[PDB]
């Protein structure tokens, strides 16, 4: 699959909302080509801005 693709926090948040508040980091990294640690990094920034409440 694809590697080192970059997305914005807004794109990830929009994806999450559109995906019913669900994110499979493995699947997402595979399909959209974003590194797993980059997805984690973006989630942390969303969490620290109080924009998302992470579960499971």
């Amino acid at each position: 699959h694809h590697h080192h693709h970059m997305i914005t926090e807004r794109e990830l948040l929009d994806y999450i909302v559109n995906n019913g508040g669900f994110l499979d980091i493995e699947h997402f990294s595979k399909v959209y080509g974003v590194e797993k640690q980059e997805v984690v990094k973006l989630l942390e920034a969303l969490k620290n801005k109080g924009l998302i409440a992470v579960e499971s």
């Binding site: 948040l13 999450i16 909302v17 508040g21 669900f22 994110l23 499979d24 980091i25 493995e26 699947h27 797993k36 984690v40 989630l43 801005k49 109080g50 924009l51 998302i52 409440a53 992470v54 579960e55 499971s56």
Partner: peptide, 13 residues
């Protein structure tokens, strides 16, 4: 202060 959107996140490791 935004209302936090709930997100279930899996397969993080």
């Amino acid at each position: 202060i935004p209302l936090p959107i709930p997100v279930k996140v899996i397969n993080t490791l």
